[PDB]
Symmetry: C5
Subunit: 242 residues, 5 copies
């Protein structure tokens, strides 16, 4: 296929997030070599378009964990690996060190479904993002303690309703997407956000810090990945001095 | 020739797991040196075939901890070491940084034995893998807190029965193998899994998160090693640009 | 001439982004030929000038006062992406190219949450009237702060009481310590970045001791790590120092 | 010329444990430089034989913390340092990165003395190693929490008797040696073991995990150093491709 | 202006402690360059003699955190920085990586003053150091939990009285100096010790582990820096192969 809108909106899709630092000797390469990089990045993404989709983000200067982030989706986990193998063979890839790499799967709603929580589910379904086009990405790995998991389905549902009630208002200016990672990475979830309004985003996270669910978090970041949304051309040119 | 099926299915076998990152200057080597790497790898595996067996897996692009994983078995722990010393002397080996290296021994059933828990023991012996051939490997180091070990044999049996109850159904599509590591590594166990269905694997680990045994884990991953199963030839070629 | 960014306004209004980054100079920087190291100072001033309509930049030397870094940059803008763009250009300079980032935290300035005129009028009056009266600051301290879930799960009133207790014994240090607060939850692995300027590190040690002793401190899961200590330096002096020039 | 037997069996002796990784560019050295490494190692050991004894062990392939371990004893701590300073000036030393280096002192029995615990002291005294010569070394750094040390002498005696009771039986196939490190390193103890039987060693450590003393451990490994006993000549040649 | 005796014995003095590893390529430099290093080191200490004093210690082979330690005092913190900046520009400095660097200030007695605790204060004088000249240094960074600082002045005094009681008997063989670091480093204190008798020092720290003050330590080492006292000339020559 593989269809972007489908891969971004259906259950059973694998999301593969990876962050990299550009090694110090990349900019010591001759200019000619660095000039060719941006086309090579766009072409490797095109080569794999039958199997994966790829988003690029610039993280340099907004955190110390990385210089860029790649978000890759496919219905086949190994296809995401294959893409990343070929990325690493590109000239930029060859001079990149991976600093984080977490995978997860999209799933149907476990908690705030029409059947389990109709009122909040209705508000989740009807919410519409209405701010300017997002400019920033945030990725937050989450892991919850054993005590969380050992609570009942009902106890957990209550806490997730409490998560949902004060955060629905932010769907006008923050896009969200949830991946499930237990067993696949040292995280239970990967959470992914797009916004143009980082003031609003800080307020959103503060609102979640303040609910009892947060008492169960053993990972809620580390790293908190903050970046700017960029096309692959712009990303690679920026990091290549082009 | 050492007996692979026996080494994989009997108590008293040492399992030696090691993950490596490929150094950034490997891909800078002349093509001839990289093209020779695949045959060096098969020659070292062949050299030690009287005493050890070896499995290879590609972890690049599915986690930040490593690019590949080796699983090595022998009844002699020093023979696994001798194999890895010779592996590190190969060209790929020489350009690999070891990132984790854990060993353990296979044992008889401690808990879910015919003597102690016959119904679940038959449930276990019962079970059969029925899905297509596994594509993925997952390795999860586990360590339990002092409170666990200080519980009685009966208290621990009960919690291991509870571990077993929800997981028996996953033997249709996940293969498992347990090694014991207390005193030989900073882990009590190494756990090893093969599957074609990472959606199912995620669900299996969630089920285990929800039981009281999990309140005792101080290590349950870190790293959670996720890879694809590959022949040695394909692994080495992939990482060599061949 | 487009107008420069307004420094005094950026440093005193809510809704400004502060970007803090610390770096180690790589070993091979000093192996560069002398002329290259000699040109580094001008390159630094040109990149700061290139971005002068959108950001402001402060430089501090941290080498010898901690193991985490050799220098600190503090960059402000109303546009987070513009702080990024300056730092991207900084990394392209000769010194930047030989700098490894060791920490980089961002946050936003905000209105008072607790010690406002409506919520705590006496302490707010003491905060608003205090004046720094010592000689010009020579040192910077940056302390990242993160509070546990239990803190955030406390009610508004419970938190206010603890921030009143934070404030009561620290007002007296406003005569010899300047402070600035940034808010980071969601944007970094911290809730706050705190920034201080002083000439008197004996006083600063006493100030932090006073805050260690209050119940609020029972909730910190990060209070430093790193505690970044440095000297205030011009860009020119910072770069020449790290370049042996 | 230092007396090995006495240094290994008397109180007041300093034990100096250090582990090292061999740098990636050692094997890139001309064959003739690596060929001389083993004689350089023997000469430095001989140079210091009036003040120290040295044991060598190969850890490569049995853990990720190191490639080799040195255990050095002297009545003068500074002599242990002087040896290691000279070791680091050898060709192999120059290409070695230290990854852990702990020191401690041997002491008289604090707990299981004839006066305080006569029955267990008798079993300790009469126990005899009866297995084949050891092939493996294990080093476990240990640190206990403030609550341990704040317990009374009698409370601690009780727990060390509980340590000793189920472990005396392993003296038949495990040799032990205790060093005390509080104030000299980030450990209260360094524990040292030699065995031919790692299956027995795993069961020994399991038995100690189960006793209440274990609730006080804040370090009990990290690293758990596992290696093989080797002569210095074999060790250096093995790491030099000779 | 700087007077050593006075900088070492008065309140209001900044102490700056830094540890370094020597990079692996230092010994690859020509012999002539390394021969010149000791003089350069001595001349940089001289250059700053009007503002700072400098002590040097060799830590290689007594721990993995460093190869040498510098202790620098001045009444001006920035002067200690200026000195270390110039040190890093020396040949050895240029090939040194800083691994820890902590500062603090000397203060009058907070607890065991004549006014507050006259008996123990007198007792600080009931023995004088009487052993052979010190050969070893130990530096232990200390940080206490919030619960400590939240105790009353009176409660804390009682605990520091309890700290001082067992400690008096080691005045014959351990010299001590205390620095205060809260707000300046990730520590509340830096403690500094000189001794010839590491058996004694081990016993001293054991005695301190056993008192209730120890339940409040979140840092008490990490690193525990152990070294030998050396002149700058002997230090730099030893690390330079000269
Ligand atoms: C932007 C507005 C937000 C809304 C409207 C929102 C809404 C929701 C909803 C409806 C669910 C339940 C999904 C299900 O039933 O399976 C959920 C789950 C989750 N959310 Fe959010 N959320 C938002 C922001 C955030 C943020 C900023 C985080 C940051 C860490 C976060 C972390 C999570 C996690 C980890 C889960 C899975 C919880 C579990 O299964 O235990 N969310 N969210
Ligand atoms: C795939 C289905 C699974 C089944 C049927 C299963 C079954 C069992 C059984 C029967 C035992 C007891 C062994 C004995 O008596 O000695 C056991 C032990 C264990 N299992 Fe699983 N398990 C599965 C998956 C997992 C997973 C995914 C983990 C991941 C961490 C895990 C971790 C362990 C550990 C650490 C032990 C040792 C427990 C102890 O001795 O305290 N298992 N499992
Ligand atoms: C120099 C004298 C100091 C004064 C007068 C002072 C005063 C204050 C005041 C009034 C606030 C409340 C702001 C609001 O209402 O939103 C506050 C917040 C804060 N202060 Fe300070 N402070 C000082 C020093 C410090 C130091 C040295 C640190 C860190 C070590 C620190 C860390 C913080 C943090 C993290 C917050 C935010 C608390 C929260 O929102 O939960 N302060 N300070
Ligand atoms: C091999 C059989 C073992 C026996 C028979 C044994 C016996 C003993 C005895 C008698 C003591 C007390 C020494 C004294 O009075 O000062 C002791 C102390 C100790 N043992 Fe073992 N032990 C064994 C294995 C181990 C192992 C495998 C460890 C690994 C952690 C260990 C860790 C220690 C430590 C840390 C101490 C010092 C405890 C303290 O002073 O608080 N032992 N052992
Ligand atoms: C060698 C003999 C020792 C003596 C005579 C001694 C004595 C003292 C005295 C009198 C004080 C109180 C200072 C004051 O009133 O302000 C003190 C504080 C301190 N001592 Fe020691 N000490 C010794 C060894 C040690 C050791 C080995 C350590 C650490 C491992 C240590 C850590 C400290 C710390 C951190 C403080 C500051 C306590 C605080 O202000 O909360 N001391 N010591």
């Amino acid at each position: 296929m593989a269809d972007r809108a489908k891969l971004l909106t259906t259950p059973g899709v694998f999301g593969n997030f990876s962050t990299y630092k550009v090694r110090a000797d990349y900019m010591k390469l001759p200019a000619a070599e660095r000039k060719a990089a941006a086309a090579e990045a766009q072409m490797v993404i095109d080569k794999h378009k039958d199997k994966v989709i790829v988003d690029t983000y610039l993280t340099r200067g907004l955190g110390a964990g990385s210089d860029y982030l790649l978000r890759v989706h496919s219905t086949d986990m190994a296809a995401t690996q294959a893409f990343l193998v070929d990325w690493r063979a590109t000239k930029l890839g060859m001079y990149s060190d991976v600093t984080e790499n977490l995978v997860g799967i999209t799933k149907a709603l476990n908690y705030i479904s029409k059947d389990k929580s109709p009122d909040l589910n209705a508000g989740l379904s009807s919410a519409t993002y209405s701010d300017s086009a997002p400019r920033y990405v945030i990725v937050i790995p989450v892991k919850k303690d054993a005590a969380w998991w050992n609570m009942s389905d009902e106890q957990r549902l209550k806490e997730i309703e409490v998560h949902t009630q004060p955060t629905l208002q932010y769907l006008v200016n923050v896009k969200r997407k949830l991946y499930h990672s237990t067993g696949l990475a040292d995280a239970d979830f990967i959470t992914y956000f797009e916004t143009a309004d980082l003031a609003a985003f800080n307020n959103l996270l503060i609102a979640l810090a303040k609910v009892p669910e947060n008492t169960h978090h053993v990972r809620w970041g580390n790293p908190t990945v903050l970046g700017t949304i960029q096309s692959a051309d712009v990303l690679v040119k920026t990091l290549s001095g082009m």
